[PDB]
Amino acid sequence: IEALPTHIKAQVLAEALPWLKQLHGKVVVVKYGGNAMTDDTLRRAFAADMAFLRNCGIHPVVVHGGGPQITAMLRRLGIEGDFKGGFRVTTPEVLDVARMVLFGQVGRELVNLINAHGPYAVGITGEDAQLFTAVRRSVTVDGVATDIGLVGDVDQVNTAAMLDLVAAGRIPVVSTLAPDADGVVHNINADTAAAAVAEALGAEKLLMLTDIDGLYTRWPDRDSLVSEIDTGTLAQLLPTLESGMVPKVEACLRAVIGGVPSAHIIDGRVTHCVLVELFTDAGTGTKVVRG
Amino acid sequence: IEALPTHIKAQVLAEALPWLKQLHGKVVVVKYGGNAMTDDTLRRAFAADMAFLRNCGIHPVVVHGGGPQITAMLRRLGIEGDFKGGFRVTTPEVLDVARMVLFGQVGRELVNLINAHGPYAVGITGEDAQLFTAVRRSVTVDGVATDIGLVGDVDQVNTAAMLDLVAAGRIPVVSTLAPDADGVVHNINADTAAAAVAEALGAEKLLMLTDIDGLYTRWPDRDSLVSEIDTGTLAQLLPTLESGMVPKVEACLRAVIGGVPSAHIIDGRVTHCVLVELFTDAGTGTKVVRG
Amino acid sequence: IEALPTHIKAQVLAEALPWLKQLHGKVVVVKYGGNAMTDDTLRRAFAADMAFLRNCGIHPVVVHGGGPQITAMLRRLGIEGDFKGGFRVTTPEVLDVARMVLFGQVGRELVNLINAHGPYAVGITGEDAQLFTAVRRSVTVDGVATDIGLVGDVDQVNTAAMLDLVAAGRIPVVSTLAPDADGVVHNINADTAAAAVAEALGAEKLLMLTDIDGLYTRWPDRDSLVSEIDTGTLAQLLPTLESGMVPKVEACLRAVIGGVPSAHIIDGRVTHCVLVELFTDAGTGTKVVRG
Amino acid sequence: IEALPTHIKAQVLAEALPWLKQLHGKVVVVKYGGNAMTDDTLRRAFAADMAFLRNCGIHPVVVHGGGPQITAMLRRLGIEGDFKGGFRVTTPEVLDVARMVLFGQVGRELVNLINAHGPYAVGITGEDAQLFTAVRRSVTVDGVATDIGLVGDVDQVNTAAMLDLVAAGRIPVVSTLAPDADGVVHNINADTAAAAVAEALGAEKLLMLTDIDGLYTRWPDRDSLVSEIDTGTLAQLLPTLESGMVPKVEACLRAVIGGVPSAHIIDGRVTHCVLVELFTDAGTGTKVVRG
Amino acid sequence: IEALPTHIKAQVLAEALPWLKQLHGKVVVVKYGGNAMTDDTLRRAFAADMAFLRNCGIHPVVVHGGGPQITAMLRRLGIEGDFKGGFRVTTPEVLDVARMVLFGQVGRELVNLINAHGPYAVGITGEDAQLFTAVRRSVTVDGVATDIGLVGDVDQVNTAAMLDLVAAGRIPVVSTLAPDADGVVHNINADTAAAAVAEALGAEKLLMLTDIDGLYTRWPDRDSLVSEIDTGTLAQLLPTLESGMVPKVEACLRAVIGGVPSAHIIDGRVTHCVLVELFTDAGTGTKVVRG
Amino acid sequence: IEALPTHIKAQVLAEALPWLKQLHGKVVVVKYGGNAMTDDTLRRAFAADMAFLRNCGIHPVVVHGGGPQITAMLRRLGIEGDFKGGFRVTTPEVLDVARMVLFGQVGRELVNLINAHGPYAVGITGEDAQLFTAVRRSVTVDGVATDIGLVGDVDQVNTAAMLDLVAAGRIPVVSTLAPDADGVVHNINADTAAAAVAEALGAEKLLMLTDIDGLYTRWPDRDSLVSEIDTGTLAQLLPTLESGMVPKVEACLRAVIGGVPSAHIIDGRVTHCVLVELFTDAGTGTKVVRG
Ligand SMILES: COC(=O)c1cc(O)cc(C(=O)OC)c1
Ligand SMILES: COC(=O)c1cc(O)cc(C(=O)OC)c1
Ligand SMILES: COC(=O)c1cc(O)cc(C(=O)OC)c1
């Protein structure tokens, strides 16, 4: 990367300026998962990018998933799952494992990675300082709503305490578990939780790291890939997308309808995708705006 | 507890006043472990007592252990241990389990218990916001110092950031793991870590919840139980005590020699032992002062 | 008080917790008078209790009377009183004496008693920093309203400056005198003044120390004593009570109708009645709520 | 005062500027007593002048005496005095009267006068918020030191709390009574107390209102009146002055030797003497500087 | 000024008190121009008066003109003017000169004069920190509106940033130039700009230094001079006044109709006219109030 | 700049991170002059770069020169210069012009350019709020020290007030003129003034924009260009450099010897030289460190 003339290095940096101005002092919530979480190079770059935002006076908040790591731990422990439709039932036992994996393993890795750059990252769940609560959610399988245990949606968010935490200079790394109104901790889908945090904190952007180039309208025709789409158009496209894309699209819809100026589906397999998406006009992602 | 005349209920409360004055606005570090951690009634009372201190303008900091829960998880996972002397070698694998159990299971229970009373508890390790670091420690077995893996002592403490956290109204619940100067996370003995936190934070008292009435000089003669002892006298008694008492005594010595006005060995099998030890003159504990 | 087992001392303290939570950070206004003011043991306990609240992060405000001490000083000075009905006419001369006794004698004793525990108490009237004003009040005697000199009701309260004073850590000890809109100082009934201060400061509780077990509906049938009563029921009972109880009941009505969550008539002859009433479920007082 | 040309009114005001700059943001302690306290016109002007300083961003602190009012109250109460030399013995009874007169009568008048201009004045003694303490003082009569009861000198001053009070915009009006280290309240000579407050608060000036034109070296030769004198020269003149001047001179010596840049003996019989002394070059007072 | 008795010096100072109270903590905007700007004695007195206000806890803001100095610089540079009616057309060249003269010459003199008394003055235009913007204004000549170049009126004012600047202790000295919404800097009439600043900052008074005794209704009958007039009466007098008085009267109208409690036309040829107008009842000015 | 692959745009941005961390929250003083000031493209890029730093939480302070613009204005005004050696004598007349040009023309252009990006820039001299003073400097011509009028060096700097100004979010744009201890304004060489400001403000870096690639040791051998040099080595090279380089080298020496971690001589003819020098490893400048 040294053969590149220095007067073009300048123009790349200078071209970051309008986005540095837009985001200065703003909250950016980032859903982190997928291959950006499993490969060491993409991992280290993601943590560096969070340090970058933070050393620009931007306020990143990281929400992470970890579905496959939970499954692997359950298999190691010999915990036999029950399944309704495609969903595992989250017994009290499965939740203890889920919480222990997400908060005590997956979150820890990211906190330490980020903290290689400074005392920034702080790991938390909804349990800590009552930062957010959960409401038990049902799923509908083959047409009927049904209970799958201690799984929920974000209910209320302690917006004040959370913003104090970021104004203090910290990068929260959120593991999506929180108590319901009776103190019973539930596990929350990380995609939906990121949308709820973005809306509650008045975030400027929601970023959804996924393992795809971007949203295709008629997958897999290559030319169906789009750069920007409004909520109304995307809401009506929702029942046609592949299974994996629906949670990310439902998140983007709830966020931007909830007032978040834009939500982005970006390719987590690209090194420094966050830097590319926020400070460059040449991202592969797809931007969701209201309309 | 209602047949008791109300004019004696008054005198019990009024008799708390000199200790409310002594501790108002002060840090109190509490090592929590033993039966006070395993029985639901003692557990719930301990969390209530932390809420009590906090609703008195006292600043509790909780450090917790969890040795037996780590062992049980290692056995569930089929992780064969290596043992030098009586010590398990903490491989990278054992540490991941230890961190996951201590921070993602044991700490979570206490945070949620305390938080039943309000948004007080916040769980953390040395990894979060670089709150404290670890230095790898050796043990000496049968006369020779020897390496037992990723085990250490508290190195430096981010005293400023930690006191900000408690001035903000929070009750930190500390899981004793922290990175060394290279970012490699170690597990720290909870007793020694509590002493280091008490000294670093300028605590007024260190409380060590143990499963014994108090320090016996010639166990098990019943009349060898003492109420108060100075560091010099106790340092010379150290090589005679039962195996389980040495870590708690070494902690009390390091703390009070380190400037902490008093350290207390109190019986964690007594419901509300904290309330008894701090606000009553009739505790069964033993108080350590300098001299 | 030492023969009492220590595990019951614990339960008494632990049972204070729900009230410590309710009152933490809250204003509690206390009308202090009667035998709680004349006997040294009850006096010293009252001052200790104010120190207690304050060392719990509660914000006590004390309003005191002193009718009999004024009378005794007037007799010592040979000031002949004029009387309309049962009321002394407060000439400019009587007011100077009243102010001098209440502020320069009675208030001083309480400030010094409280201050034996720390730099807490601060004595004041409405004159100081224009903290509250008075409006001249009439009385009605044998059916007709009539002027009895420089006697009034609290008019406006400098709520902001007063709360600054308590947020600063101080325990105001208020002598009920204040200027009217022309700067002419009036003496205010201490019971009514306490109700006005409680309402103006947004107090959580008003406590009225009196020399009786509590409110009797049909004095003196012993079983007419009640524990709790709403404002509507008590307002209609008002014209039947003994002469001495009316000012305390009118105060409780004005306070709780004014928004104060509860007002309490408690027995000032009981040592530590404040501690008993606030932190115990076994008080002899009577609680007034709205309805 | 209207026949005076307006271009000379201008020059008088403009000539205040160098002293407005010198005193802006500074503490000025003022001993108030004498005829400036007994005549209504001089009284009202003094209170106006305190409002003036305060509406210039200057921080006045007022210390007042009241010897003759105490005597008159003792005579009204039939309290027979005991006298050693020329000193009344301050029994516990005499002190209660002294405190009640100074704090509950004399201080009240000044607070209300000042407060006619705004919410400025606040009355206090050493008892309030433990603002200052007293140490019992002896007197020497006919050559021998001797006890005259509960009379003392200022011991320690809560400098921090006092300056908070003035930074908050208040004009403390101090009645010179304070507890000793055992809580026993003593009465303090107002002149000496003013010097101790000036030194403790880092005052820029001490003003001593007296009933004389200024310090005469050889009273009563008219030409012995001086405008300025250093501490060394005045210390050696001390044993020759008239009885009434010694307390004021001892105060000026202790203050300016204690670090106070200048102390002034000014004529309290002149209307607005404070305004004249501080903002004009034509004062009749005498200025004391170190040397 | 020394033959004047000192008890009349006192009364002049004491008579400032009601105006010191009215203006304490308030913004006073002062249009400075005319002979008060050209003569060294009047200049130095004006700067002293600004120091005076500031050493009274008053917040002066100075707006200055400089028409004749611009003309003289244009003549020195050989810049030929174009004139429509009586107005010079402000080409880009004339503006550069105007800005350079007003900000780099005329403002500098006043900043240094004021700063002889302390670090008070700070020079600024609308360009600095975007403190205010301009909107291009037309003039009407011989009946028709017409463009005269880069001349405008104050558009929006950064009220927050400006008050921060004065709360910080500074005396802004404003040169009336500001960018329009496209960043193109315009020159603003100093009289109108002073009115807009007074209204935007919530000033207590606007002072307009002019070279006349005050407003005459039927110039030049001597007895037509008035002391006070309401906006309605003065608005209807507007089309009759001499050419030079209209900008000052239009300013006073816009200010006081805009909410400014009073605007004053005062004689800038009088030494210390500001001190005379604000702190004395004997000013020659004319006061404008709403009605 | 769009044909460049986006995964290399990423690496350029990511490579800024170590310098974003080093400079976050730090003062950077920038001497701005030369062709970076005369060409519109380089001008606009410089202002953008100042906005960039500021939108990264870096604190730029800009010091500007303007020698040639002063000369041109003097020629336009027909002001005949006097010359001793190669130096113009700065008469009171030349200074008024210099101040008017630097502060009222050259500084204004940069403030408005920067402010196109936000309310950042604020123009000032040493005169404003007494921000810094000047001491008259002599020059030595043909071997003898000699007076050349109102020219000086920075004397003292109001470090506190200046850092308040930058902590408030502002970008000071400094015109190098300041009063001496008698209030007489002098003109200061902009290069030396930048070094004095960097040292006084505890800057992390001093940047000197010049019209050369960097420091050559044996100009003009191309291979004598160096990347980094210590103060000791450069001090001994000083008497050999071309005339134009000495002021920039003397500045770098005074700054880094004064404690500034590094000073940089960078090529002001390169677009975005600031971005290149601070956030890239490929700058053409020369870095000066202590040794
Ligand atoms: C020292 O860093 C912090 O302030 C910190 C650290 C944490 O681990 C959690 C929290 C938190 O949840 O605040 C409500 C705050
Ligand atoms: C040093 O303690 C204080 O702040 C204090 C003391 C007093 O005696 C009165 C007041 C008061 O009335 O504040 C408005 C405040
Ligand atoms: C050090 O004084 C200042 O704070 C100061 C000085 C200036 O010359 C301008 C400003 C300003 O415009 O603030 C927005 C502030």
* Domain spans in chain C, listed from the N-terminal domain onward: 1-291
* Interchain contact E103–F (C-beta under 8 A): yes
For helices D92-101 and D67-76, give the axis angle rounded to 10 degrees.
120
Distance of CA E25 to the CA centre of its chain: 20
- For a substitution probing ligand 1, which of A165, A174, A201 has the most ligand atoms within 8 Å of its CB? A165
Three-class DSSP category at C7 = helix
Contact E171/F at CB under 8 A: no
CA dist A165 to A23, A161, A198, B133, C110, Å? 18, 6, 15, 22, 44
Question: Please, what is the end-to-end C-alpha distance for chain C in angstroms?
Answer: 41
Residue E130, chain F, CB below 8 Å: the answer is yes
Does the beta-carbon distance from B128 to A130 stay under 8 Å? no
Half-sphere exposure of E101 (CA within 13 A, CB side): 20
Question: What are the Cα distances from residue B163, in Å, to B30, B171, B172, E79, F55?
Answer: 15, 11, 10, 67, 31
CB contact under 8 A, D100 and C100: yes
Element (H, E) at A151: strand A151-157
Whose tokens are 């935007």? That residue is: E200
Cis status of the peptide bond prior to E220, with omega within 30 of 0 = yes
Could you tell me the strand order of the sheet in which E185-188 lies? E132-136, E151-157, E185-188, E177-179
Residues with Cβ within 8 Å of D261's Cβ and at least 6 positions away in sequence, in order, are D204, D205, D289
* Chain D residue with Cα closest to C165: D165
Map residue B103 onto helix, strand or coil: helix
Q: What is the CA radius of gyration of chain E?
A: 19
Q: Considering only CB atoms, which chain E residues are within 8 Å of F77?
A: 76-77
For A287, the 3-state DSSP assignment is strand
Q: Is it the case that chain C and chain A have 3 or more CB pairs lying under 8 Å apart?
A: no
Give residue A165 CA to ligand 1 midpoint distance, Å: 7
* CA-CA-CA-CA torsion sign (F151, F157, F158, F159): positive
B contacts of C14 (beta carbons < 8 Å): 45, 48-49, 52, 272, 275
- Output the CA–CA distances (angstroms, integers) from residue A246 to A215, A283, B113, B171, in the order listed: 10, 21, 36, 39
Handedness of CA E277, E280, E281, E282 (dihedral sign): negative
Dump the DSSP string for D226-264.
Answer: -SEEEHHHHHHHGGGS-GGGHHHHHHHHHHHHTT-SEEE
Cβ atoms of residues F59 and F25 within 8 Å: yes
d(CA D31, CA D122) in angstroms, rounded, equals 16
Q: Tell me the H-state helices in chain C.
A: 6-14, 17-23, 35-38, 40-54, 67-76, 92-101, 107-114, 159-167, 190-200, 231-237, 246-257, 273-279
Residue of chain F whose Cα is closest to the Cα of A269? F7
**Closest-CA residue of chain D to E269:** D7
* Other CB atoms within 10 Å distance of the CB of residue A146: 14
Q: Which of A235, A176, A227 is nearest to A32 (CA)?
A: A176
Strands (E) in chain E, as ranges, are: 27-32, 59-64, 83-84, 87-88, 121-124, 132-136, 139-141, 144-146, 151-157, 171-175, 177-179, 185-188, 205-210, 228-230, 262-267, 286-289
Q: What are phi and psi of C73, to 5 degrees?
A: -65, -40
Q: Could you tell me which residues come within 8 angstroms of residue E114 by beta carbon, excluding any fewer than 6 positions away? A: E47, E50, E51, E120, E121, E171, E173
Q: How many CB atoms lie under 10 A from the CB of residue F164? A: 13
Residue C87: CA count within 13 A, CB half-sphere: 19
Sheet with D177-179, edge to edge strand ranges: D132-136, D151-157, D185-188, D177-179
Ligand 3 atom having least distance to the Cα of F123: 8
Using CA atoms, how far apart are residues A201 and A36, in angstroms rounded to an integer? Answer: 24
Tokens of A36: 């950006």
Q: What share of chain C is helix, strand, coil (3-state, %, to 5)?
A: 45, 25, 30
> At A284, is the secondary structure helix, strand, or coil?
coil
- Interatomic CA distance for residues D112 and E194, integer angstroms: 41
Q: Give the span between the Cα atoms of E194 and D235, in whole angstroms.
A: 58
Please state, in angstroms and rounded to a whole number, the distance separating the CA atoms of residues C56 and B279. 13
Q: Please check whether residue E72 touches F, CB under 8 A.
A: no
- Residue of chain B nearest C22, judged by CA positions: B55
d(CA D251, CA B72): 78
Q: Please name which of C207, C197, C159 lies closest in space to residue C175, comparing C-alpha atoms.
A: C197
Q: What are phi and psi of F86, to 5 degrees?
A: -95, 10
Distance B169 CA to ligand 1 centre (A): 11
The CA D126 to ligand 2 mean position distance, Å, reads 12
Tell me which residue of E271, E232, E222 sits closest to E45, measured CA to CA. E271
Task: Check CB contact of F64 with chain E, cutoff 8 Å.
Answer: no
Q: Method used for this model?
A: X-ray
The residues, any chain, with a CB within 8 Å of residue A131's CB and separated by 6 or more, are A124, A125, A157, A158, A161, A162, A178, B119
Give dist(CA B129, CA E74) in Å, integer: 63
CA distances from E99 to B166, E30, E96 (A): 55, 20, 5
User: Is the torsion defined by CA of F86, F87, F88, F91 positive or negative?
Assistant: negative
Residue B85's region, left for phi above 0, alpha for psi from -120 to 50, else beta, is left
* D18: preceding bond cis by omega (within 30 degrees): no
* Residues whose CB falls within 8 Å of the CB of residue E66, separated by 6 or more in sequence, listed in order: E33, E37, E101, E102, E105, E106, E190
Nearest CA to F249 out of F284, F203, F216 is that of F216
Q: Do E48 and D14 touch (CB under 8 A)?
A: yes
| CA F82 distance to own-chain centroid | 27
Question: Which residues from chain D sit within 8 angstroms of residue E283, using beta carbons?
Answer: 6
Q: Where are the alpha helices (DSSP H) in B149-207?
A: 159-167, 190-200
Q: Which of F144, F174, F137 is nearest to F157 (CA)?
A: F174
Candidate from F52, F56, F276 with C-beta closest to A6 = F276
Asked if residue A127 has its Cβ within 6 Å of ligand 1, the reply is no
Instruction: Name the packing angle between helices F92-101 and F67-76 (round to 10°).
Output: 120
Residue with tokens 């709830």: A254
Query: Taking a C-beta distance cutoff of 8 angstroms, is the pair C198, C161 a contact?
Result: no
User: Which residue type does D98 have?
Assistant: A
Query: What whole-number distance in Å separates Cα of residue F157 and Cα of residue F151?
Result: 17
User: Å resolution of this model?
Assistant: 2.2
User: Of F274, F283, F290, which Cα lies nearest the Cα of F214?
Assistant: F283
As a whole number of angstroms, the distance between CA B265 and CA B211 comes to: 10
Three-state DSSP state, E174: strand
- CA D171–ligand 2 middle distance (angstroms): 10
Q: What are φ and ψ of residue B214, in 5° steps?
A: 160, -175
Residue B11 amino acid letter: Q
Integer Cα distance of F285 and E206 in angstroms: 54
Ligand closest in space to the Cα of E162: 3
Phi, psi of B130 (to 5 degrees): 50, 45
- Most ligand 1 atoms within 8 A of CB, residue of B61, B164, B165 to mutate: B165
CA atoms within 13 A on the CB side of A167: 7
Surface-to-core class of residue A11, CB atoms within 10 Å of its CB (0-12 exposed, 13-18 middle, 19+ buried): middle
Between CA C266 and CA C276 the distance in angstroms is 9
With H, G, I as helix, E, B as strand and everything else as coil, classify residue C256.
Answer: helix
A in contact with E (at least 3 C-beta pairs within 8 A): no
Known binding residue D67? Answer is yes
Provide the CB-side half-sphere exposure for B85 (13 A, CA): 12
Residue D236 phi, psi (nearest 5): -75, -20
DSSP 8-state assignment for residue B48 = H
**Structural contact between residues C253 and C220, judged by C-beta atoms closer than 8 angstroms:** no
Q: What are phi and psi of E245, to 5 degrees?
A: -85, -20
Interface residue of E21, E56, E281 to substitute, partner D, most D CBs within 10 Å: E56
Exposure string (b/e) for F265-284, b if CB count within 10 Å is 16 or more? bbbbbbbbbbbbbbbbeebb
Nearest to C208 by CA among C20, C44, C29, C27: C29
CA distance A8 to C36: 85
Structure tokens at B215: 């320090």
With residue C174 as reference, give the H or E element that holds it: strand C171-175
Q: State the smallest CA–CA distance between residue C162 and chain B in angstroms.
A: 22
Cis before F220? omega within 30: yes
Write the residue with the smallest CA distance to atom 7 of ligand 3.
Answer: E122
CA A154 to chain centre: 14
Full 3-state SS string of chain F: CCCCCHHHHHHHHHCCHHHHHHHCCCEEEEEECCHHHHCHHHHHHHHHHHHHHHCCCCEEEEEECCHHHHHHHHHHCCCCCCEECCEECECHHHHHHHHHHHHHHHHHHHHHHHCCCCCCEEEECCCHHHCEEEEECCEEECCEEECCECEEEEEEECHHHHHHHHHCCCEEEEECEEECCCCCEEEECHHHHHHHHHHHCCCCEEEEEECCCCCECCCCCHHHECCEEEHHHHHHHHHHCCHHHHHHHHHHHHHHHCCCCEEEEEECCCCCHHHHHHHCCCCCCEEEECC
Determine the residue of D61, D108, D165 to mutate for testing ligand 2's pocket, defined as the one with the most ligand atoms within 8 A of the Cβ atom.
D165
DSSP-based three-state secondary structure for A270: coil
